[PDB]
Amino acid sequence: GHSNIWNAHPKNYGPGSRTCRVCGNPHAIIRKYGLMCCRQCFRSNAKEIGFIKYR
Amino acid sequence: RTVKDVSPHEFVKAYAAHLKRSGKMELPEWTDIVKTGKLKELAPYDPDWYYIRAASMARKIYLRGGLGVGGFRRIYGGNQRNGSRPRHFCKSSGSVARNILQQLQNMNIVDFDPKGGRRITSNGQRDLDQVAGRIA
Amino acid sequence: KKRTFKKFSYRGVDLDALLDMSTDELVKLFPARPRRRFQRGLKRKPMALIKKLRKAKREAPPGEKPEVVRTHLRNMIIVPEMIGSVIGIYNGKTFNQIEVKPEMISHYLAEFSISYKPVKHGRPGIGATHS
Amino acid sequence: QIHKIRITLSSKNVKNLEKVCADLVRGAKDKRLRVKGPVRMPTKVLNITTRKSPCGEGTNTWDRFELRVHKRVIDLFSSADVVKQITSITIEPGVEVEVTIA
Amino acid sequence: KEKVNNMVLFDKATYDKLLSEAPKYKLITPSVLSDRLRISGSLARKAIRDLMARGSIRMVSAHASQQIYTRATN
Amino acid sequence: SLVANEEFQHILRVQNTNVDGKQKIMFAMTSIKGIGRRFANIACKKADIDMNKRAGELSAAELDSLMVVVANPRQFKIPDWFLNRQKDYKDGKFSQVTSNALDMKLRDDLERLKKIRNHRGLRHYWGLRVRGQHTKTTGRRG
RNA sequence: UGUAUUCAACGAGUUUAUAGCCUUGGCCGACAGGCCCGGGUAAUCUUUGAAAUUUCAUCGUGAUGGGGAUAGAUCAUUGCAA
Numbered sequence A: 001g002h003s004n005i006w007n008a009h010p011k012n013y014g015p016g017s018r019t020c021r022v023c024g025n026p027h028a029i030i031r032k033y034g035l036m037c038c039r040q041c042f043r044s045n046a047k048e049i050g051f052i053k054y055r
Numbered sequence B: 001r002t003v004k005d006v007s008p009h010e011f012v013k014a015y016a017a018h019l020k021r022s023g024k025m026e027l028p029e030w031t032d033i034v035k036t037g038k039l040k041e042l043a044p045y046d047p048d049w050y051y052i053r054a055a056s057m058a059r060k061i062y063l064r065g066g067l068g069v070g071g072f073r074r075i076y077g078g079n080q081r082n083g084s085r086p087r088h089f090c091k092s093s094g095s096v097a098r099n100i101l102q103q104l105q106n107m108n109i110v111d112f113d114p115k116g117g118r119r120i121t122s123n124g125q126r127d128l129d130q131v132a133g134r135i136a
Numbered sequence C: 001k002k003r004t005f006k007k008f009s010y011r012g013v014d015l016d017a018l019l020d021m022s023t024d025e026l027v028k029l030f031p032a033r034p035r036r037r038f039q040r041g042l043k044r045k046p047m048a049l050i051k052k053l054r055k056a057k058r059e060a061p062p063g064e065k066p067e068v069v070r071t072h073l074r075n076m077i078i079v080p081e082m083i084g085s086v087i088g089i090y091n092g093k094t095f096n097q098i099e100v101k102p103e104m105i106s107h108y109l110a111e112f113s114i115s116y117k118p119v120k121h122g123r124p125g126i127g128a129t130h131s
Numbered sequence D: 001q002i003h004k005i006r007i008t009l010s011s012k013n014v015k016n017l018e019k020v021c022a023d024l025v026r027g028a029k030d031k032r033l034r035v036k037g038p039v040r041m042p043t044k045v046l047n048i049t050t051r052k053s054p055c056g057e058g059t060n061t062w063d064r065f066e067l068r069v070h071k072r073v074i075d076l077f078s079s080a081d082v083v084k085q086i087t088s089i090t091i092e093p094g095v096e097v098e099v100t101i102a
Numbered sequence E: 001k002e003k004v005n006n007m008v009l010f011d012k013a014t015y016d017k018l019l020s021e022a023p024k025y026k027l028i029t030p031s032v033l034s035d036r037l038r039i040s041g042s043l044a045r046k047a048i049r050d051l052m053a054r055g056s057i058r059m060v061s062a063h064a065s066q067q068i069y070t071r072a073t074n
Numbered sequence F: 001s002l003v004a005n006e007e008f009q010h011i012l013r014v015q016n017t018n019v020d021g022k023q024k025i026m027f028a029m030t031s032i033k034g035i036g037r038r039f040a041n042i043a044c045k046k047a048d049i050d051m052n053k054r055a056g057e058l059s060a061a062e063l064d065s066l067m068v069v070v071a072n073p074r075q076f077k078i079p080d081w082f083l084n085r086q087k088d089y090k091d092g093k094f095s096q097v098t099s100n101a102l103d104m105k106l107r108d109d110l111e112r113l114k115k116i117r118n119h120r121g122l123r124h125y126w127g128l129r130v131r132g133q134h135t136k137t138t139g140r141r142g
Numbered sequence G: 001u002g003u004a005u006u007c008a009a010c011g012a013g014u015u016u017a018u019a020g021c022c023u024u025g026g027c028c029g030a031c032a033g034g035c036c037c038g039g040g041u042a043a044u045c046u047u048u049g050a051a052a053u054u055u056c057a058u059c060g061u062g063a064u065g066g067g068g069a070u071a072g073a074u075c076a077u078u079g080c081a082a
């Protein structure tokens, strides 16, 4: 589309400005500590990341 | 006999009376119209609330010598009712604290701490100690 | 001359003075929200809309209302200069027609183009009760 | 030519961190240097609690995920060259070593 | 039920009744005076203060939420 | 002073509003529409009335003083932000409206909103909430 | 309700760009908020870090100083837009 129109809406904040770094989904993003992973992807990769279940 | 050896309530009353008798305090014109904080529903009941607050703040500075306006806002804050929503902590008026600190400084009771906040002066220590001694 | 029973006024200012008043002085009479909106600065679209309204007013034949100016700007704030203009306001489906009156200044164009149809209730269907 | 060299050690494994601290302390002692520490800072426990289900169905069950970071501080009173030589000893993976002055 | 028509200010009969019998009560509290003399709690507190000033009663124990007073002499 | 004086009044009238004589002045004045505990407190302070007295104890001149204080807040140094009618729509003046004046102002606001077909005015006309509250589950009376 | 009084724990915090996150201190303001020096990538700074409660007064059985739904006027902050 026209440069001034195509993708012209600001995306400086809100759920639409962030996505999962693993799958790109914009929902249920864990922003704590800079993980920037969705809860499903984080639960899949927790052991590799270094998070352990003690209780 | 010092302030630590007397009840805080009695010392606060005595020092508020002493401050009022001194005549060096310059109450702002809005003392009779403002609440002590956004969390309050009504203005202070006691007409001498300004002097009591000044005495309490002077005692606090005497005990600890690094307090600022925000610290006093926290000290005199409390729960805020929100109608049908639960209560949460709320700060008190900062203008009252700033004015009281400036007035106390004008009387040489406190000064500026090099690390920030306010500190009790030797004259302030002497005055508070004498007031506590005379309480008995 | 004409005698008006209820002469329009805004914060003790007559209608004639409002038009001649500048934006800086006019903003002080507005409430907090329009004042903040103006202080932050209007974008190109509201300026284009006011220019279009001006042009429509100029081309209006004497003693006749101006043509219709249609826009999507539901967040535009009505200023005294727009009094008497005919504006079509998009509500998401259609451009609703209104005429700007002196009493609507400092309001949003959304406030005069309802985006929903008021509800008139029919008889409850299956599954309304016995919950 | 004497300075208080500050060594900060951070790791997720307690055993490796403790062994590295002991090795550094013994190396400093072997050179007749003055060693203060190691000082154990309070453990940092990063915590994430996320729902087990990838959807919204079933009893709401939660996983408590913790990542523990252990930090140690060692102070040496000596020159930069000797501390640099001491820190050159082999360090196992997962232990970060930072050397600074004051 | 019928609302209690407590009086916020004393009348002469009730004030005299107070000064006569109140010093002879084993237990004196604002609630007791309010129930007996049919007075408001504030008026009861003021009357208790007045009696204490007159010396006809003594303070067994004073608290913000409870004031206990009794006759000065048996 | 504990004994009621012969001039004690059980009921008094102010702006066609019945004021209880047994209640304290600060909270007795609150019976007037447009006057609350805060405004009553400041008005009593500005009129030099003793707050420890009941409504019936005082004299009529003191009620007149209270009413002039209420009717002229600016003259007595009451700030603008403390008034219930700030920056009036038509006059642009700051004042404390009370009694039937408050109802007149409320009616004027509602009718002005309704006349221009403002959304808030339409919601008021239809008898629905005007401050964005959900209406599916609460506010059920008819 | 209005004073006076004073006891936690688990945690979280910055791109430095004039400055972005947690923010002390000073000044302005009734509040909401604003301005200026600065600290902290942290057991280093926010953090000198709560309320219920304790204490003394007002209220006095009255939908009452209980309750805070609904609504009017008006002032700020976030945001491109309330």
Ligand SMILES: [K+]
Residues within 6 Å of the ligand: F135, F136, F137, F138, F139, F140
């Ligand atoms: K409803």
Ligand SMILES: [Mg+2]
Residues within 6 Å of the ligand: F029, F030, F031, F032, F033, F034, F035, F036
């Ligand atoms: Mg009222």
Ligand SMILES: [Mg+2]
Residues within 6 Å of the ligand: G007
């Ligand atoms: Mg503490």
Ligand SMILES: [Mg+2]
Residues within 6 Å of the ligand: none
């Ligand atoms: Mg009530």
Ligand SMILES: [Mg+2]
Residues within 6 Å of the ligand: none
């Ligand atoms: Mg209440």
Ligand SMILES: [Zn+2]
Residues within 6 Å of the ligand: A020, A021, A022, A023, A024, A025, A037, A038, A039, A040, A041, A042
């Ligand atoms: Zn993902």
